[model samples]
Target chain A: SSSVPSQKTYQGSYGFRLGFLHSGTAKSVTCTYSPALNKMFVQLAKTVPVQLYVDSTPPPGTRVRAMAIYKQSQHMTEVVRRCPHHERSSDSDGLAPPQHLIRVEGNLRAEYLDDPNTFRHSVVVPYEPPEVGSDYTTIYFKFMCNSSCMGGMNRRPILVIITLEDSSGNLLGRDSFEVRVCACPGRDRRTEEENLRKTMDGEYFTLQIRGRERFEQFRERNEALELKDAQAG
Target chain B: SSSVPSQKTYQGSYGFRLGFLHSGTAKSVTCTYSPALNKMFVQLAKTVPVQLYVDSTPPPGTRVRAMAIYKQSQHMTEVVRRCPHHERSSDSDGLAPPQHLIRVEGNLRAEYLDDPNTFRHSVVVPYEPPEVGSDYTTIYFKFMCNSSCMGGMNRRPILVIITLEDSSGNLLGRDSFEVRVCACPGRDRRTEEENLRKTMDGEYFTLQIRGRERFEQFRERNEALELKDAQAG
Candidate 1:
């Protein structure tokens, strides 16, 4: 440890702790790093399922529907399955982290909204690459609001905790992430104003997203360099 | 007045008690109408400056930045305006009342980010006659996340309290509003993936935005309808 507390202040990383992505909230999510199980833990309210996908290189095309063009040209409607490796599961086990993960979409069994006028959405992305820089990734979170992306407050805060550990419950690493999306009331640079408004219908919806990750692999590269220097010495 | 808790519900008049746009806590933000204050109140942790742009609209290109081709695209990097209003200090006031007026644009402040991985974005449309269909009116709130349009555990819960009152704090009406924004994950959604990674870079932040009110003038149209109904009776 370079500077434990006084100097470096090893800020114990705070992250979205998803105990075990099982069928339901884990019977109990426990972690152990030190000789005594002392890594971290989480008590889930329910078993949340999640879908994930990535686009190292996203292809561009107009996803607007036929009716959307005439009704709401600016709004993005209808989702397409473009990424070939989109995966869904009830657990996080025996997994080999990818170079870049687009987004972690999850489902909470309990209904979280009480008003027709108010809507709620969430996302979690955990990227554990074998290396850095060489790996390129991006994530997307689509919020399909009844209102257009240009109406009222279009986005909200998102929280994520990425826990990296071994199968035996030993803590390996951890990461946290978030993004604040600002509203774009009128500027329809790519899409036309008409299209954007068309999507603002009562039943219409909007999308909000963010992405980034810690490159463990990139850090490892530095360690390798250090090892080479030691041998030379 | 309609039915009591013991009696069956009624939907006769447009009494200000219940509407799709009611507000309360996350668990209570559904279609329930609360008669506490005149109208429904959207409870906020702190007061935030809300802008209200009357007679005008958001800057020319608001959405383009978020939907820009690259993350660093000028659109995403730049800011835009939404409604035409001003900022309110959260420290001075409590939660904002329903329909409080505020303005918006692309330019957003940093106080709004709840964490490194998530923040809010909104698109606002000035109420205009051409935009609405028939003579119907609408009001609502929406939440966004990095999840895709479908699949996974589904969604998160948001707290909202809708109120109906004049600027002077006079009781006028009341109702509750709620909607569940699904955090669907998908591949090809590049921007969202990028956001997830960034979130892990830091801890969660707290952001609050106050709601503003806007009025649309249909002029004689509504009054004329009232006259016709009275004569027929």
Candidate 2:
């Protein structure tokens, strides 16, 4: 049967850029993407409110599910740390530590400015798209699991899959993202064939600073916008 | 800073073909790779002995690790069986089921022809490669986790990462494969974007039959080989 199915590329009109939010009328906290690793590096201790930037509005029925997402908690440093822990770690491990897998499922909420509904778990900035070259079409994702598991180590790959669901609770389409949630997001970097000796200190620490610095800039910008409006009023 | 990092393609000296064993020795079990889905399909119920075929020998000291390997067992069918179970099922999911992450770390032990190393868990056929037109070189991979996790549903992407480890347990290089372990490897087909409406019934059932039929043929051929050797002697 000369039959090989046609392969389709991931279909989508929009993509999401992950960020963070500050207090009241939030701002985007920019992060870094390690394309080489195919992972978005994120901090652990300061796992702030996740804000996703969509270039364009997605399909109407689109919702999201996060699976296979994990990170190195305080538990792992005490476990799989410092390269030489393999030989005997396996010999006597009558029952090895169970790998911690976190499951976080969320919805796309808050499609409008100042949504009155305070109970929704997550939100999208506005249900509608704005002008060209605007700030960003934001999706507010309240991350459910942040380093909550018992034993996980650095540079672990996390998968975020988003799907469009009909009323039947099933989906029409889906896409995914690879994210690395970590304390260092840099010093603790290395997943595919981990590199333990030398660290990704250059970009990781630099990006760590950038995450905070970018937040400050966004915060100050928001204050300026508020001050200008107040003066006019 | 004009730096985005080069996206290096996965490099390798050889590739592994996952198969199974009969009784005394093993022949290739011959599974299928859904390149369309970027996954290798395998059965869960009859999770037989895993035999890997390598065309050429891999680098020495290249230990392997299997992470993120899961399948729908007797556990999941009892959990997320059919569609339309998500509405209230999630509304009051104060705490959902914990995902099972199985960690299977193995070494390429059997290098020579039947080296009397009884204690080792896994083995590679012959550490050295054979002639160009010979049968496959087998790597006996003792799959550590098989449907052991609870609450895992069908068609989840399972990652199989293989890496080279130095004496200190650090790795020099790596590669990976995506495998889906399922009871109804066909009925339970769907991932990347799940299609719960329909499944890969066609090839799945056909391959299921082939998996058994091929084993029979191998068994008969082995009998023929032993008969020839006996008569000649």
Candidate 3:
């Protein structure tokens, strides 16, 4: 039995927490992960919206930038995810609604960081309050990955940071979270194809995304506003 | 009759029109000046408010800064008028009321451009929208002078450019108007005390302010907001 190999199972559920910082206010991120569908349901609770003016609207296609930083044995991996613009719609009250408190879902199996087409789904919805409110606001970001990518997770430090900016390049707010994958040591001996297939088959894989829903709604809303500004022009 | 030196009547009314430029949007300034009280009834017709965020509120005792640039012969007189902070009040609806459209009067007789204590009287009321209109807003500046300071009529080019800035040192908007004393050429040769007394006793004087109302309201409103932010802090 000592000579026999020991096996670890990756079929269990794994999740991490995310925190936000804006003007020194801190908020946490909550999520429900589903390994079967490779999806995560995220929500940022009780967050305020950013202040905005109609004339101050940014140009079209402005993006909410998300970056993933990780290290694989001294080799740093930095991947950026630029999401598509979201639609801007006013509620029946003729006021721009708060965008942060809504439920959002993202497919964890999509290779969004590399594929432009799929990357479009990786978005941030900016939360804008009515013209009058305390100056706090929230935005949310959605990130995902596929089977062949997130395997061999034994002692790699993963950090994610998301930032939202206005048309004038003013940083509205920022949020960050870190993930640590710990299983058995020496998992690097596995072949690339074997690791890929193993992660794909849900044998011994680790996938994690930790972020709150604050700036995403604003980013999504402004993207729409920017598009409208373009069309109006 | 020769002993009187043929003096002109100061009771004769004299005034000028002001112009304004805000974010490249032009708005005209019109005023009714009264030599009796040395007051100017100022109006800024149609202008927009500068963008703002409540979280970036200014520090305490901050004032709405106003400046007047005039030339007495080649000697340029650069005077700054820091108006007292206006009252900060929100409408019943929890939104800032329309600050752009309002008729305001100020005594131009005071030393507005140079004196710190008296300069507090010089002010601009920013035209803030009612949280529901286009970003276009108005600002009004009340500038005044007394008979003692403004009686000297000569080729003094009175160029007054008023600028409004946020606590962050960002120029929200700026508007300028110029006035020229075109009464007579020999007036410069008169003794300073003689000119002062002559101008005060209604010996014929002409004064004017030329600028638009649009940017004036923004400057005034932002100034008030900055002051409120400071007080709240």
Q: List candidate 3 stretches off by more than 4 Å.
A: A1-233, B1-64, B71-73, B78-127, B143-155, B168-173, B180-233
When sorted by TM-score, best at the front, the candidate numbers are 2, 3, 1
Candidate 1 TM-score, true structure as reference: 0.17
Index of the highest-lDDT prediction? 2
Worst 10 residues of 3 chain A by lDDT: A1-10
**TM-score between model 2 and native:** 0.25
Off by over 4 Å in 2: A1-9, A12-31, A45-132, A140-148, A151-157, A166-172, A190-233, B1-233
lDDT of 1: 0.25
- Chain B TM-score, model 1, reads 0.23
Between candidates 1 and 2, the one scoring higher on TM-score is 2
Which 10 residues in a row give candidate 1 chain A its minimum summed lDDT?
Answer: A62-71
Q: Which ten-residue region of model 3 chain B has the weakest summed lDDT?
A: B1-10
* lDDT per residue as tens, model 2, A1-233: 11111112234456544443322211232334454554555543233233445565666655543323222232222322212332134453222121212222132332211213421111222233434766553332322223322333333434544443333435333444555544444443344214321234321111111134433543454456557758999
**Candidate 3 C-alpha lDDT tens digits along B1-233:** 01111111111111111233322111222333323222222322222122222222233422233444443423343332211222222322212222211113332221222233432123333322325543333344432321122332122344444444444434444444443222221232133335556556655242111123423433454456557758999
